[PDB]
Amino acid sequence: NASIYQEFVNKYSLSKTLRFELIPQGKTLENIKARGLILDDEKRAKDYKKAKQIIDKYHQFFIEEILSSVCISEDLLQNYSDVYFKLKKSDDDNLQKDFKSAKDTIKKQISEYIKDSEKFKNLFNQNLIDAKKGQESDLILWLKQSKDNGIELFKANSDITDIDEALEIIKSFKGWTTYFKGFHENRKNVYSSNDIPTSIIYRIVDDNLPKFLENKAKYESLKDKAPEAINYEQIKKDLAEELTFDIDYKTSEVNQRVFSLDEVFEIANFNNYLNQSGITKFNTIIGGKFVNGENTKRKGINEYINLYSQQINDKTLKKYKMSVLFKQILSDTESKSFVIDKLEDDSDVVTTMQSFYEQIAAFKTVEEKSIKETLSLLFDDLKAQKLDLSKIYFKNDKSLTDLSQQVFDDYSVIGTAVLEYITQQIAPKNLDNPSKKEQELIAKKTEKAKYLSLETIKLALEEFNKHRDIDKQCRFEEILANFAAIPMIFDEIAQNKDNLAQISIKYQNQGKKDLLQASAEDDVKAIKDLLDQTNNLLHKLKIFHISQSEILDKDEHFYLVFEECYFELANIVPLYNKIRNYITQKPYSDEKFKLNFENSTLANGWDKNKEPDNTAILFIKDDKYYLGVMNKKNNKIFDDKAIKENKGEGYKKIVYKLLPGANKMLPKVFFSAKSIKFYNPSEDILRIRNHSTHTKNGSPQKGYEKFEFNIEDCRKFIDFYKQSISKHPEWKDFGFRFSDTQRYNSIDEFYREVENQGYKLTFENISESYIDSVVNQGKLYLFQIYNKDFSAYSKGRPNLHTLYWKALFDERNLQDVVYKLNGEAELFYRKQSIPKKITHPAKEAIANKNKKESVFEYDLIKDKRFTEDKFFFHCPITINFKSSGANKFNDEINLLLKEKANDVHILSIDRGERHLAYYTLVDGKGNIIKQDTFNIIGNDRMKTNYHDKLAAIEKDRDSARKDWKKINNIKEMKEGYLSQVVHEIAKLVIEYNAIVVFQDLRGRFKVEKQVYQKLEKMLIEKLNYLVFKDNEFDKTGGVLRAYQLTAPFETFKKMGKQTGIIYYVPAGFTSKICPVTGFVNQLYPKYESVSKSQEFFSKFDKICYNLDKGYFEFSFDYKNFGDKAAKGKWTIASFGSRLINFRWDTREVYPTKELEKLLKDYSIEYGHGECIKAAICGESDKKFFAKLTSVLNTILQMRNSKTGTELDYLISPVADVNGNFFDSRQAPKNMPQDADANGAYHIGLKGLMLLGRIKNNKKLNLVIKNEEYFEFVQNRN
RNA sequence: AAUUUCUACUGUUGUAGAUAGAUUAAAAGGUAAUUCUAUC
DNA sequence: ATAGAATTACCTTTTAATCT
Ligand SMILES: [K+]
Ligand SMILES: [K+]
Ligand SMILES: [K+]
Ligand SMILES: [K+]
Ligand SMILES: [K+]
Ligand SMILES: [K+]
Ligand SMILES: [Mg+2]
Ligand SMILES: [Mg+2]
Ligand SMILES: [Mg+2]
Ligand SMILES: [Mg+2]
Ligand SMILES: [Mg+2]
């Protein structure tokens, strides 16, 4: 049976690259190493990285210079801001155009500034690095000027020593300017006025300007609604350095001073936040900073906002949180906050540890006692009540809470005890309501008090126990006992030290960095442990430490001795951070590097004419393919003379002919002064060329006036191009077969025909003896292009990439090209990265995961490919070369779907916590044909659960981050797993004439297990060019005629809700809805007030108990509530039990019995079937409405699941026509067996609505509003 | 337990399926340490 | 014991440009 997508073949051209191994042939590798080419290119990669760093320093200076010259007027900024805020409340077209114009005028200002500078003329051309003898290069001039001045550009750079080495490096790349072409293209994107995020124009205007305006709005709104939020005096003291600016752009005053927050948020002063320095200032104003030697961190705006929010208990203030500005496009980032030193190697770590612990061991206080003995005696005297508890204090911070949790198993015991004691002491009368002065005194004595005396704690606890029960009361002796056990910790530490003794010697060598290796895990596990132990001790002592308040009267001997000890111990904080920062690094791994073979243009073009200049040639021998690179000194090996002289049977050399960019190439050859006389152009053809009458918008020659386009002129010009092509020496051999000139309506059509037909591969036979000679002498370097399919023992279906490569040269492809070979291929070298461990030696039994054992005559080495040095070949090709990219691809897909809508199915896919992905196949009527999870994707005998695999990897990564172990990759597992899912989905799409449907949510999931967006992206990519290896070479679905069922997808930003056959529906109410009735919970019952909740409950029609069915019925009409988006009359029932997730753990809740208990407690009679709605609305108790609303929510919770188990079911609170309530546990085959299945099925129903809109359609919209969705789903059936 | 490379394999010097590279920039998130605070 | 707002350090993944 034929597929409906048979027509969608060869629809648009796309680009791919294939990857192969290069296997050196004969003496090739010997000659390579003899000349040391691999060494040369290894050094050149390092030099190239350095050169790019140097160019980047020049670019950073240029950017700072431009942004220092730039000034954006306050009027432009205010106009932008006004239109920008007006855009928020309306989508009108005039506002869109006005915003576009303001954005573009600001961009134009900055773009003029960048064009004006002199350096910009030579910023991306050859003149940067290499110039002639007359003038030196701009980069070299800037380096020499910087050296002449007192500035050392490469102090921060570790790879470059000084500017003299920088000069060496730039001078070494003379004659290699083309090597930087691409890089310079990258750099052009930094200054482009187009809407590309790589530009500083973009970063200022598209990114940072809206953030600053939003922050200014938030600042003024906060000033109105929370004036007491930010402490302006303190923030001006703390952040003076970042509030200092030279120029107030509102008043134009060139005065350097500390700005007010009012000034920093004046719109014009946005001019101060364009460069990286001002960006860091502004972001520091938002974020505060740590200052070396100050124990308290200085606060920014957001911290004052959050503290005030916590103070007055208003979470609405979270709305006014400031947004950090994004960095400037090439800037090195400077931190205003403190930055810790760095340990260099293993020896640093071990020596610093040993110094710390020897210091802690040998230390003695003024009372000549060790830390251990001293703390022991101190806490023993404390235990024995020998000290004045009114002169010893606990910090009233998290340390006291931690103590309460550790000793009384409740963090709030000590705090509430002290609050009750101070409340009872300051005001015995009016305990519930303190006075206006007593409230401030209370809070100042407890909440505001930095420290609390042990006296206060003890008396508070003793008064607290009176009103506490006997089984659970908290005694001060328990706190004293906790402190008396602390010295023992020291002894425990001792043990580890001796063990670590040995460990120290292991890593006492310097420069080794062996602690970053995985083999050191065990030893690291010890180190961390010791550190962790010490750290914990520190915190247990931290509660006594007094911060930088240098006031309360204290036992001065106690505190002298304690602070001596604590100061010595507290060096563990820096040591801990240093060691963590070192060990967590991932160890250095070699990367592959580019091979050039002494050629800056090694594979930039395969054309025969370019062979001596690019030196890359392709050969075919039997069924094998070969890449050959000519020695730079011997690049005439395959000139025409040698080919004629050495015609032989051995190798088939590819001869490559390409006529690219016809619109520039043809007139370059025909009107060039060298040959313009040859292709004799008439005066009329020259008149067509001079005034561009053959084009609508082309440029005229020699400054003539452009004449209106004339199709007759265009066709005569096309005919001159044809005549000239036939006169041309090399192009005549393309065998062009143009359509009739009268068929053309545009010059571009003819150009496209030229470019389509202007690619031809042919072959020349060459003596094997000649290839062997030239590869032996070292004049040719020869490699076989290889993957596992070219093995003599392959004997199976090949890789898709193998098929594409072979099709490049297939007779059937060459007669009408779909696979075209492109230029700018690349060669790489990859050094061996793991030791060759022979994992399964020959003639030994090996265990099978599914025969129970296997044996082989040969060895089997794990990761053999990484146990030796290898060459690689990245080769770019174009597929569907003669067709062009179709803008109207979605429209054609929709036309096809409208014609054959009866054959169409809906493959809808949802995600879940329990299911990585879950699919639902729906027929045109809305019935479910298929449904299964994608967690298990092992077909046939072997089944693999990639959900468990991915969840295990996630747990492993969490464990690793915590334990300083190497974080293993989860990305490769997700890609290998999704390949199978994509395969299955393609198969389904074609077997069932399906369209795929997903839900709208971007890129911020933070559940490492989740795979939804990656699956979308991989599926789009696959459906761009769908080949089935089992199809026929020239039939639909084969190599020449692949399915194209999706649009190209350049970005997600561009992509709407349809790419080809993949549609997106809103995720709203896809899984929290009934599959039978369509009921959805748009009553949102929350408890606010008694008046509000009785107002709510009076909107129902009736509320009663049903005896004949034994459950409560709430009947209502959705029209009586806020919005008519959901409409209709519904009766909901307390039928069935529910599962509640709390802290996770789960709980069985029976709502009918809870409703019974609540009605008995308030003595409302329901037992005879009476309607109790009036009695509900008349109740006055807060608790009644709170519990009623809670039970009503529980009734509406259709998704019920126990976390940590399989069950995730869905029960409806609405009964069907037969009186049954849907439950996924006992649901028919055509019904969703699962909550996630329900989500998939309703995503599919939204897709079915879309199919309907396609079938019945000009101006087709795939926007699905909730109203139409509800009407569709719950209307019938 | 072999790979252009990934995943699952042993399917026997390999078997399925997938596989757009190079370069450049930026963002997002995770974990720890530290600061100030809020919680029935 | 949860958690919020910051800073620093280490890490992985994702997205969007240029060319092919
Ligand atoms: K400026
Ligand atoms: K102010
Ligand atoms: K590590
Ligand atoms: K490779
Ligand atoms: K497939
Ligand atoms: K893959
Ligand atoms: Mg001005
Ligand atoms: Mg060259
Ligand atoms: Mg194969
Ligand atoms: Mg290149
Ligand atoms: Mg493997």
PDB file of C-alpha atoms in Angstrom, chain A residues 476-638:
ATOM      1  CA  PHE A 476      19.651  22.752  79.197  1.00  0.00           C
ATOM      2  CA  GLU A 477      21.832  19.892  80.468  1.00  0.00           C
ATOM      3  CA  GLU A 478      21.398  18.300  77.027  1.00  0.00           C
ATOM      4  CA  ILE A 479      22.984  21.345  75.354  1.00  0.00           C
ATOM      5  CA  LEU A 480      25.825  21.302  77.874  1.00  0.00           C
ATOM      6  CA  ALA A 481      26.285  17.579  77.207  1.00  0.00           C
ATOM      7  CA  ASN A 482      26.433  18.130  73.453  1.00  0.00           C
ATOM      8  CA  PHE A 483      29.204  20.669  73.966  1.00  0.00           C
ATOM      9  CA  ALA A 484      31.080  18.401  76.394  1.00  0.00           C
ATOM     10  CA  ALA A 485      31.321  15.664  73.745  1.00  0.00           C
ATOM     11  CA  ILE A 486      33.002  17.950  71.189  1.00  0.00           C
ATOM     12  CA  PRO A 487      36.668  17.331  72.224  1.00  0.00           C
ATOM     13  CA  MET A 488      36.358  13.636  71.303  1.00  0.00           C
ATOM     14  CA  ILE A 489      36.109  14.757  67.663  1.00  0.00           C
ATOM     15  CA  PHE A 490      39.804  15.690  67.781  1.00  0.00           C
ATOM     16  CA  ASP A 491      40.811  12.112  68.593  1.00  0.00           C
ATOM     17  CA  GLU A 492      38.760  10.849  65.641  1.00  0.00           C
ATOM     18  CA  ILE A 493      40.569  13.281  63.330  1.00  0.00           C
ATOM     19  CA  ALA A 494      43.856  11.820  64.590  1.00  0.00           C
ATOM     20  CA  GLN A 495      43.088   8.439  63.016  1.00  0.00           C
ATOM     21  CA  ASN A 496      42.599   9.880  59.540  1.00  0.00           C
ATOM     22  CA  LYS A 497      45.833  11.867  59.809  1.00  0.00           C
ATOM     23  CA  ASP A 498      47.969   8.737  60.112  1.00  0.00           C
ATOM     24  CA  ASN A 499      46.243   7.164  57.114  1.00  0.00           C
ATOM     25  CA  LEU A 500      46.694  10.437  55.233  1.00  0.00           C
ATOM     26  CA  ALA A 501      50.366  10.261  56.218  1.00  0.00           C
ATOM     27  CA  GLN A 502      50.869   7.598  53.573  1.00  0.00           C
ATOM     28  CA  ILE A 503      48.607   9.433  51.110  1.00  0.00           C
ATOM     29  CA  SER A 504      50.778  12.533  51.496  1.00  0.00           C
ATOM     30  CA  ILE A 505      53.942  10.764  50.350  1.00  0.00           C
ATOM     31  CA  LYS A 506      52.071   9.450  47.317  1.00  0.00           C
ATOM     32  CA  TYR A 507      51.404  12.968  45.994  1.00  0.00           C
ATOM     33  CA  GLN A 508      54.376  14.879  47.438  1.00  0.00           C
ATOM     34  CA  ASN A 509      55.856  15.182  43.927  1.00  0.00           C
ATOM     35  CA  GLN A 510      55.230  18.543  42.277  1.00  0.00           C
ATOM     36  CA  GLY A 511      53.577  19.385  38.976  1.00  0.00           C
ATOM     37  CA  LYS A 512      51.845  16.019  38.714  1.00  0.00           C
ATOM     38  CA  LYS A 513      48.107  16.808  39.110  1.00  0.00           C
ATOM     39  CA  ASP A 514      47.401  13.096  39.707  1.00  0.00           C
ATOM     40  CA  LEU A 515      44.584  13.933  42.136  1.00  0.00           C
ATOM     41  CA  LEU A 516      42.393  14.956  39.175  1.00  0.00           C
ATOM     42  CA  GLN A 517      42.615  11.427  37.743  1.00  0.00           C
ATOM     43  CA  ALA A 518      39.851   8.941  38.501  1.00  0.00           C
ATOM     44  CA  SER A 519      42.453   6.466  39.786  1.00  0.00           C
ATOM     45  CA  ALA A 520      42.905   8.777  42.791  1.00  0.00           C
ATOM     46  CA  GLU A 521      39.207   8.633  43.797  1.00  0.00           C
ATOM     47  CA  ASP A 522      39.828   6.390  46.807  1.00  0.00           C
ATOM     48  CA  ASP A 523      42.614   8.607  48.142  1.00  0.00           C
ATOM     49  CA  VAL A 524      40.545  11.747  47.488  1.00  0.00           C
ATOM     50  CA  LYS A 525      37.682  10.104  49.388  1.00  0.00           C
ATOM     51  CA  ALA A 526      39.989  10.093  52.413  1.00  0.00           C
ATOM     52  CA  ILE A 527      41.208  13.683  51.992  1.00  0.00           C
ATOM     53  CA  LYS A 528      37.700  15.102  51.679  1.00  0.00           C
ATOM     54  CA  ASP A 529      36.597  13.100  54.717  1.00  0.00           C
ATOM     55  CA  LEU A 530      39.275  14.651  56.911  1.00  0.00           C
ATOM     56  CA  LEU A 531      38.391  18.110  55.609  1.00  0.00           C
ATOM     57  CA  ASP A 532      34.670  17.464  56.099  1.00  0.00           C
ATOM     58  CA  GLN A 533      35.307  16.285  59.658  1.00  0.00           C
ATOM     59  CA  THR A 534      37.296  19.411  60.472  1.00  0.00           C
ATOM     60  CA  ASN A 535      34.640  21.559  58.832  1.00  0.00           C
ATOM     61  CA  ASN A 536      31.910  20.070  61.007  1.00  0.00           C
ATOM     62  CA  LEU A 537      33.941  20.702  64.162  1.00  0.00           C
ATOM     63  CA  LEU A 538      34.293  24.321  63.051  1.00  0.00           C
ATOM     64  CA  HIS A 539      30.532  24.769  62.789  1.00  0.00           C
ATOM     65  CA  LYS A 540      29.899  23.110  66.149  1.00  0.00           C
ATOM     66  CA  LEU A 541      32.254  25.682  67.649  1.00  0.00           C
ATOM     67  CA  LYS A 542      31.015  28.539  65.449  1.00  0.00           C
ATOM     68  CA  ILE A 543      28.061  29.200  67.777  1.00  0.00           C
ATOM     69  CA  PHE A 544      30.405  30.724  70.377  1.00  0.00           C
ATOM     70  CA  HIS A 545      32.457  32.872  67.996  1.00  0.00           C
ATOM     71  CA  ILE A 546      31.929  36.635  68.131  1.00  0.00           C
ATOM     72  CA  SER A 547      32.089  38.471  64.800  1.00  0.00           C
ATOM     73  CA  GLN A 548      33.308  41.977  63.896  1.00  0.00           C
ATOM     74  CA  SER A 549      31.366  44.060  66.413  1.00  0.00           C
ATOM     75  CA  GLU A 550      34.662  45.648  67.542  1.00  0.00           C
ATOM     76  CA  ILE A 551      29.212  45.405  72.679  1.00  0.00           C
ATOM     77  CA  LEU A 552      28.376  42.879  75.426  1.00  0.00           C
ATOM     78  CA  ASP A 553      30.124  42.117  78.703  1.00  0.00           C
ATOM     79  CA  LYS A 554      31.608  38.634  78.688  1.00  0.00           C
ATOM     80  CA  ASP A 555      33.883  36.270  80.612  1.00  0.00           C
ATOM     81  CA  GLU A 556      37.051  37.651  79.049  1.00  0.00           C
ATOM     82  CA  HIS A 557      39.280  34.681  79.930  1.00  0.00           C
ATOM     83  CA  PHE A 558      36.808  32.212  78.420  1.00  0.00           C
ATOM     84  CA  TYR A 559      36.638  34.243  75.218  1.00  0.00           C
ATOM     85  CA  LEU A 560      40.374  34.989  74.973  1.00  0.00           C
ATOM     86  CA  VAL A 561      41.148  31.282  75.130  1.00  0.00           C
ATOM     87  CA  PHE A 562      38.237  30.197  72.941  1.00  0.00           C
ATOM     88  CA  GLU A 563      38.961  32.785  70.252  1.00  0.00           C
ATOM     89  CA  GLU A 564      42.629  31.809  70.169  1.00  0.00           C
ATOM     90  CA  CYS A 565      41.496  28.238  69.456  1.00  0.00           C
ATOM     91  CA  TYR A 566      38.771  29.210  66.994  1.00  0.00           C
ATOM     92  CA  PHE A 567      41.023  31.584  65.050  1.00  0.00           C
ATOM     93  CA  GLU A 568      43.549  28.790  64.608  1.00  0.00           C
ATOM     94  CA  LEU A 569      40.868  26.301  63.538  1.00  0.00           C
ATOM     95  CA  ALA A 570      39.107  28.704  61.168  1.00  0.00           C
ATOM     96  CA  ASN A 571      41.809  28.414  58.500  1.00  0.00           C
ATOM     97  CA  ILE A 572      39.913  25.334  57.285  1.00  0.00           C
ATOM     98  CA  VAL A 573      37.438  27.481  55.337  1.00  0.00           C
ATOM     99  CA  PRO A 574      40.062  28.789  52.858  1.00  0.00           C
ATOM    100  CA  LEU A 575      41.918  25.472  52.785  1.00  0.00           C
ATOM    101  CA  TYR A 576      38.660  23.648  52.036  1.00  0.00           C
ATOM    102  CA  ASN A 577      37.753  26.007  49.194  1.00  0.00           C
ATOM    103  CA  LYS A 578      41.261  25.799  47.708  1.00  0.00           C
ATOM    104  CA  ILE A 579      41.386  22.006  47.753  1.00  0.00           C
ATOM    105  CA  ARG A 580      37.856  21.677  46.354  1.00  0.00           C
ATOM    106  CA  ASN A 581      38.648  24.158  43.575  1.00  0.00           C
ATOM    107  CA  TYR A 582      41.701  22.100  42.691  1.00  0.00           C
ATOM    108  CA  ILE A 583      40.395  18.530  42.877  1.00  0.00           C
ATOM    109  CA  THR A 584      37.047  19.157  41.125  1.00  0.00           C
ATOM    110  CA  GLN A 585      38.899  20.187  37.943  1.00  0.00           C
ATOM    111  CA  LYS A 586      38.648  17.722  35.146  1.00  0.00           C
ATOM    112  CA  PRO A 587      42.107  16.505  34.095  1.00  0.00           C
ATOM    113  CA  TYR A 588      43.612  17.734  30.849  1.00  0.00           C
ATOM    114  CA  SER A 589      42.767  15.659  27.780  1.00  0.00           C
ATOM    115  CA  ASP A 590      44.381  15.967  24.368  1.00  0.00           C
ATOM    116  CA  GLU A 591      42.146  17.043  21.504  1.00  0.00           C
ATOM    117  CA  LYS A 592      42.431  16.244  17.825  1.00  0.00           C
ATOM    118  CA  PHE A 593      44.179  18.910  15.783  1.00  0.00           C
ATOM    119  CA  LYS A 594      43.871  20.075  12.202  1.00  0.00           C
ATOM    120  CA  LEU A 595      46.279  18.665   9.624  1.00  0.00           C
ATOM    121  CA  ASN A 596      47.321  20.985   6.803  1.00  0.00           C
ATOM    122  CA  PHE A 597      50.265  19.256   5.062  1.00  0.00           C
ATOM    123  CA  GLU A 598      51.983  22.639   4.563  1.00  0.00           C
ATOM    124  CA  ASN A 599      48.913  24.056   2.777  1.00  0.00           C
ATOM    125  CA  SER A 600      46.809  26.961   4.028  1.00  0.00           C
ATOM    126  CA  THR A 601      44.111  25.894   1.530  1.00  0.00           C
ATOM    127  CA  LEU A 602      44.244  22.120   1.936  1.00  0.00           C
ATOM    128  CA  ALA A 603      40.744  21.227   0.816  1.00  0.00           C
ATOM    129  CA  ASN A 604      39.119  24.531  -0.094  1.00  0.00           C
ATOM    130  CA  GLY A 605      38.125  23.302  -3.557  1.00  0.00           C
ATOM    131  CA  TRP A 606      38.210  20.082  -5.523  1.00  0.00           C
ATOM    132  CA  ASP A 607      38.120  21.587  -9.036  1.00  0.00           C
ATOM    133  CA  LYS A 608      40.835  20.316 -11.364  1.00  0.00           C
ATOM    134  CA  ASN A 609      42.022  23.898 -11.993  1.00  0.00           C
ATOM    135  CA  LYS A 610      42.537  24.280  -8.232  1.00  0.00           C
ATOM    136  CA  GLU A 611      44.346  20.942  -7.680  1.00  0.00           C
ATOM    137  CA  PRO A 612      47.943  22.316  -7.525  1.00  0.00           C
ATOM    138  CA  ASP A 613      46.763  25.054  -5.160  1.00  0.00           C
ATOM    139  CA  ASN A 614      44.714  22.815  -2.836  1.00  0.00           C
ATOM    140  CA  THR A 615      46.653  19.534  -3.323  1.00  0.00           C
ATOM    141  CA  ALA A 616      43.716  17.244  -2.349  1.00  0.00           C
ATOM    142  CA  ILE A 617      42.711  14.529  -4.839  1.00  0.00           C
ATOM    143  CA  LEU A 618      40.299  11.566  -4.732  1.00  0.00           C
ATOM    144  CA  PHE A 619      40.860   8.085  -6.156  1.00  0.00           C
ATOM    145  CA  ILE A 620      38.670   4.990  -6.510  1.00  0.00           C
ATOM    146  CA  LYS A 621      40.129   1.483  -6.704  1.00  0.00           C
ATOM    147  CA  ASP A 622      37.699  -1.457  -6.950  1.00  0.00           C
ATOM    148  CA  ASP A 623      35.187  -0.813  -4.120  1.00  0.00           C
ATOM    149  CA  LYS A 624      37.508   1.401  -2.042  1.00  0.00           C
ATOM    150  CA  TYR A 625      37.902   5.190  -1.903  1.00  0.00           C
ATOM    151  CA  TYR A 626      41.146   7.079  -1.356  1.00  0.00           C
ATOM    152  CA  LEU A 627      42.182  10.589  -0.355  1.00  0.00           C
ATOM    153  CA  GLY A 628      45.558  11.773  -1.643  1.00  0.00           C
ATOM    154  CA  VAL A 629      47.458  14.890  -0.580  1.00  0.00           C
ATOM    155  CA  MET A 630      50.260  16.101  -2.810  1.00  0.00           C
ATOM    156  CA  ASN A 631      53.490  17.281  -1.243  1.00  0.00           C
ATOM    157  CA  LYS A 632      53.514  21.074  -1.429  1.00  0.00           C
ATOM    158  CA  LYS A 633      56.848  21.015  -3.276  1.00  0.00           C
ATOM    159  CA  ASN A 634      55.495  18.392  -5.737  1.00  0.00           C
ATOM    160  CA  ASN A 635      51.994  19.596  -6.647  1.00  0.00           C
ATOM    161  CA  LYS A 636      52.341  19.018 -10.401  1.00  0.00           C
ATOM    162  CA  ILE A 637      52.147  15.232  -9.880  1.00  0.00           C
ATOM    163  CA  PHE A 638      48.740  15.164 -11.558  1.00  0.00           C
TER     164      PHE A 638
END
